[PDB]
Amino acid sequence: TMMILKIGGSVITDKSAYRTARTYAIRSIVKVLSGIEDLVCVVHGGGSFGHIKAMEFGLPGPKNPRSSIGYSIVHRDMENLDLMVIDAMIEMGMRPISVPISALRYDGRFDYTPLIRYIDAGFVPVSYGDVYIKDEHSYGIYSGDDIMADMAELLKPDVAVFLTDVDGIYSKDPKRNPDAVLLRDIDTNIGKKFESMVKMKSSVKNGVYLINGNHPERIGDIGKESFIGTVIR
Template structure:
């Protein structure tokens, strides 16, 4: 089984509030289906979650009760996004159902707690595909917190022990500098824990869930269970399909 995260940067326009990239999402879902592989899918919140979360500083937990309406709105918005993604998956024959982390998980000071994954395991056991996503989740210490799509990936990796883990982003992989700004940026094909401190932490625009440094940290955590994570560009038609079929493509492989 392959665990795949569709990043918020590929399924939404993160610069515009609630801008769903339906055409690109549909293509990626079609590529996943065409691979014929058994998969589980997580997706990021993109502009459905990050815009208001940043505006109201939701990542820091409850600081002001004026944040509460934003918590409700973000939960509503990311569920709307998830239903859009699931709709495209169903169109290509994937039996997907949206499973909001805010309804089945809890956090403690920013750490995701998965005490009882029975409902998720039961769905997968009968062939239904649970689709998790970035969400606002109750936090025992901070009132609420943000469960990133990467944290959901870590949880599913521990539960299902996938053979491969793939992160689909809007760049070919990790670079020595921001490839969207620096012409001399070079793709880093392999990354491990020792190299992490040497990497430029501003490879992409920082977001509320920790930016690229947070992503690499989460990928390294997941590698502890599954050995390798792959970061690949989902904006290039056919690249995800090629990767899933075992072909060589430009990407970054992250190992512990």
């Protein structure tokens, strides 16, 4: 009855302002996560601790002096964000342990052996969108969503949840066009995330959910008539 969960950068950071964390949201979300008894792995996105320097330094992209310096900066930044989520989890008495993708062997897939040892021993491993060395000439950025896809394939969990700062997948950006309709249900019969969630669904028995991280208690409404967000089925 395992759950894997991603905390979206859009909801724990202000995506428009470099290194701006939203501490309340982090705490508010972690409080709900700590009550989830079968939560086995947490991932988080980077928002303003990721995307802004990545774009400025040429990540992902060819290796060169600027992108090599950017590699160290973006990872350091993502570590700083990660420690705020780790501190909140420790406060709620969880047993988190961060396992950064940057520290794993990569040979086209990442060697998640250390993360699986942590789950087996009863920890909740925490990982996050990160830089990695994709090949001799290229640095890549592996996103929180890519990590979720990988966990979904490896663990075959019962449920996978993504928290973002809107209520679900809509017909159109609910922030620009105030008309947009909520797709409360998508049948296997923002664009890249949607594509990853659909792909994942074939490994996730009981559905992949997008939920508003600003109302994290909605996670407890999964499977109930009061649920608000998107289920991919």
